[PDB]
Amino acid sequence: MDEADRRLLRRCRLRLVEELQVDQLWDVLLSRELFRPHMIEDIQRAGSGSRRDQARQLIIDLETRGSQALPLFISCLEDTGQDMLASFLRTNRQA
């Protein structure tokens, strides 16, 4: 992941952890080979296991999953009906 994408993920930290729905997201992430299944189990157990803690670990770990991790992640957002969040992300990448 390039520095600009990483920086984007940090800038949007608050919004991501506040709004990301994860339970519905795992299938999408798998389909696009963003994470291996055990990686997902680890993220699921991050911290207290709340939605927020899972979300946070997801987006941190996301930075390590490749050059195209960010656009692929936006797509998974789209695929799971999180258009608003995906929209917030995209309009930054472009910005």
Partner 1 sequence: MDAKARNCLLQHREALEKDIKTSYIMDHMISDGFLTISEEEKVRNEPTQQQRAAMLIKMILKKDNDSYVSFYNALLHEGYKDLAALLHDGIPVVS
Interface residue with partner 1, options 33, 47, 50, 83 (CB under 8 A): 33
Instruction: Kindly determine how many residues on this chain lie close enough to bind partner 1 according to the rule CB under 8 A.
Output: 14
What SS3 class is residue 34? coil
CA–CA dist 21, 67 (Å, integer): 23
Minimum distance of partner 1 from residue 38's CB (angstroms) = 7
For the chain, breaks with the C atom over 2.5 A from the next N come after none
| Residue span binding partner 1 (CB under 8 A) among the ranges 11-19, 36-44, 51-59, 86-94 | 36-44
Position 31 contacts partner 1 (CB under 8 A): no
CA distances from 86 to 33, 38, 42, 45, 75 (A): 18, 25, 24, 24, 8
Position 45 contacts partner 1 (CB under 8 A): no
Minimum distance of partner 1 from residue 76's CB (angstroms) = 14
Based on CB atoms, which residue is closest to partner 1, 29 or 85?
29
